[PDB]
Amino acid sequence: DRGVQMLLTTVGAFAAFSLMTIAVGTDYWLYSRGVCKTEEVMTHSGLWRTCCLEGNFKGLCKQIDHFPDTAEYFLRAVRASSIFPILSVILLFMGGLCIAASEFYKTRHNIILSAGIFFVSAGLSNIIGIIVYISANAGSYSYGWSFYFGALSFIIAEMVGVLAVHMFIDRHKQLRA
Amino acid sequence: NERYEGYCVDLAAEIAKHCGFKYKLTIVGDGKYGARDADTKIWNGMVGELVYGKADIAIAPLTITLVREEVIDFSKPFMSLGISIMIKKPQKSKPGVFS
Amino acid sequence: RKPCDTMKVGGNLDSKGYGIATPKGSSLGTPVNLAVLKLSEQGVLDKLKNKWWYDKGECGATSALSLSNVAGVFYILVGGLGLAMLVALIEFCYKSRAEAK
Amino acid sequence: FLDPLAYEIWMCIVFAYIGVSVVLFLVSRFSPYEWNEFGIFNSLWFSLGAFMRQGCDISPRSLSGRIVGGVWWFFTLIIISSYTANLAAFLTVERMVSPIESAEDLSKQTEIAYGTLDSGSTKEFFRRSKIAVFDKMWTYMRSAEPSVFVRTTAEGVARVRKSKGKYAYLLESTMNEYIEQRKPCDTMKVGGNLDSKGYGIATPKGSSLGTPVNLAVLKLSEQGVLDKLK
Amino acid sequence: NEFGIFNSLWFSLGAFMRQGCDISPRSLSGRIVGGVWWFFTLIIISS
Amino acid sequence: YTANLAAFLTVERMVSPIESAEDLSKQTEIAYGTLDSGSTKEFFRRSKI
Ligand SMILES: O=c1[nH]c2cc(C(F)(F)F)c(N3CCOCC3)cc2n(CP(=O)(O)O)c1=O
Ligand SMILES: CCCCCCCC/C=C\CCCCCCCC(=O)OC[C@H](O)CO
Ligand SMILES: CCCCCCCC/C=C\CCCCCCCC(=O)OC[C@H](O)CO
Ligand SMILES: CCCCCCCCCCCCCCCC(=O)O
Ligand SMILES: CCCCCCCCCCCCCCCC(=O)O
């Protein structure tokens, strides 16, 4: 059907954007046995802040130091600056803008295709971000709800991109018909 | 006394407290532990400071050997040890991006 | 001690000890012997060992295939997806321009 | 059967699968100038079958669809080859891992029980210890049901041999080393000594035998008699 | 061209020997069955 | 490619590090030595094992 699809894509875009922004913001990416401030105790290693839990001084949070081959340096850079998660957030925002501007300027249907391309690119950036995150960590533990919020953002972004392209195809089908 | 710190410093402090007597830590001048020169039969190092009354007690990491147990009295060992192997750390190798 | 690049691997080969020396006929010998045994029983010696070897220490204390082993293939995959998207869009722009304006 | 690859590889395989399917669909269907049997459902099926090294039934004909297909094929080849190779390595050399290798390890986890003899220096060492790890061990054992305490060393070894890996017995190093080397060799000794103690030769309150036996023991130790005898 | 009993058997056999298909299911149910059997085959042959 | 990868992973899986002393006696890749002159040197020299 039609009419529902625009609302569903808008809702999905908002959900993906919110999830990814929260995930980049929060710090429950990794539960590891690190050190809170500078013994061992469980932590809240996020993208930026490793923070202490279930200890004498739980709730103390410190900025992660991402440094003490050229590949190692470049990976450390790319992971220190969460460029790929941030780029994911920005692309999701631009896709949201494209969907919003669809209601106006409806005549031109290449603005909704842009929305689709932005959402799919957001998904790809999210994948690269997860891969660099995990790889940098690798050079007992667990993943917290922030990581899975990032993952769910990826899934929803890819679904919303599919829907955007689907409705672009329908619009050009109507126009040619 | 306050100028120094270490395992032996704390051990000496506790021993004194148990026995109840002041003390003055003094390093060995020569810088050796103990050895009987075959010719002279001289004891250098803290074993010297013990045999020739120059000191009253040694609280250093002094091995309990036979050549040494003869001329002085050793307390029951306060730290057991031995020879051991030391190697470089494993240094787990990061796989290449295109490995 | 830093840089923390070494490791003790094998248990001890031989067995010796360290002791508190005293002059051959000094009255301190018996009391110091009993003091050492009392400390050893009370765990003070173990605590001092911990304090001076570990508390002042400058350091802390699978077989599956890890993502690090196959990371490059993921990078290549996503790079190829991006390139594919770019090529598609370039062709689409070219076709849009191609129609007789 | 998932053990050859880490959980992260499986997760990223699923992500890459969805990404590839979506990009193949987009790149094949979006252009109005194309209007490809490559809807979203057919794109997902293509990707799945490419991964499982099964047939195609359709292959992208455009440049862009072919780029996507090619990289996904390369990915699949490497990942499946790597799975097979690592499983071979697993099944060739079996590497059993000791669950605990230290005292602090026994303290930190709780899956495996452990306890000392009913009464002895082994018990007291924990009953009256101020050390973090031994304090924690005492806290656990003081209340452990069923009683982690045995009536005899024979009972202790029998109990550790009965339990698969649930129970760990704390005893003197020398007896532990003796037991380990005997049949059926069902048990091993892990980690270092928790404390230090010595065995010696006694002697009456005062005698002339003590002074020379001390020299004898030191001479034996230094010569290497005691190590060789042990 | 469609999955009768004999063609179903042939499809399954060929999927097990990794010997490609002349026909593959087109429906959601057929594709679920096919996909799961492909997974099974991949694990068992690798093993 | 698959067979050589398997060889790589199998070999890397059967690599045992050093665990004892006699393990130093058996191999020759890892050199080992003691202090120039001291108790450990003598212990080895007069060693009857
Ligand atoms: O009684 C003795 N006690 C010793 C105690 C120690 C230490 F462990 F450091 F406390 C050392 N260290 C070994 C490394 O070089 C010097 C420092 C040497 C000692 N030596 C000399 P040895 O002849 O080499 O044994 C003795 O004689
Ligand atoms: C006609 C249709 C065309 C389809 C086209 C898609 C097929 C792509 C396939 C494989 C790409 C593999 C890329 C290999 C990149 C490896 C480069 C590399 O890393 O080499 C340097 C090395 O790291 C130094 O140590
Ligand atoms: C387009 C329609 C295609 C239809 C779909 C075809 C089926 C897909 C193939 C395989 C499924 C494999 C399922 C894997 C199940 C994993 C179970 C698991 O992970 O449990 C282990 C546990 O996590 C450890 O503690
Ligand atoms: C196409 C198939 C989809 C895959 C289905 C996956 C079902 C199992 C997922 C298990 C997740 C376990 C969570 C791990 C916990 C952690 O260490 O973070
Ligand atoms: C073509 C893409 C699908 C391929 C099939 C992949 C399904 C496996 C996913 C399982 C999730 C990971 C859980 C297992 C790891 C673990 O818990 O040890």
Numbering used by the authors:
A (entry chain G): 5 to 42, 55 to 84, 92 to 162, 173 to 210
B (entry chain C): 418 to 516
C (entry chain C): 715 to 775, 784 to 823
D (entry chain B): 517 to 551, 569 to 763
E (entry chain A): 569 to 615
F (entry chain C): 616 to 664
The authors write:
AMPA glutamate receptors (AMPARs) mediate rapid signalling throughout the brain, and orchestrate various forms of synaptic plasticity that underlie learning.
A GluA2 mutant (F231A) increasing NTD dynamics phenocopies this behaviour, and exhibits reduced synaptic responses, reflecting the anchoring function of the AMPAR NTD at the synapse. Contrary to these, GluA2(F231A)/γ2 exhibited splayed NTD dimers, reminiscent of GluA1, although the conformational space of GluA2(F231A)/γ2 appeared narrower. As in GluA1, we obtain particles (about 10%) without domain swap between NTD and LBD, drawing a further link between NTD B/D interface stability and domain swapping. As the NTDs form tight dimers in the nanomolar range, the domain swap (and its reversal) probably involves the LBD dimers, which are substantially more flexible.
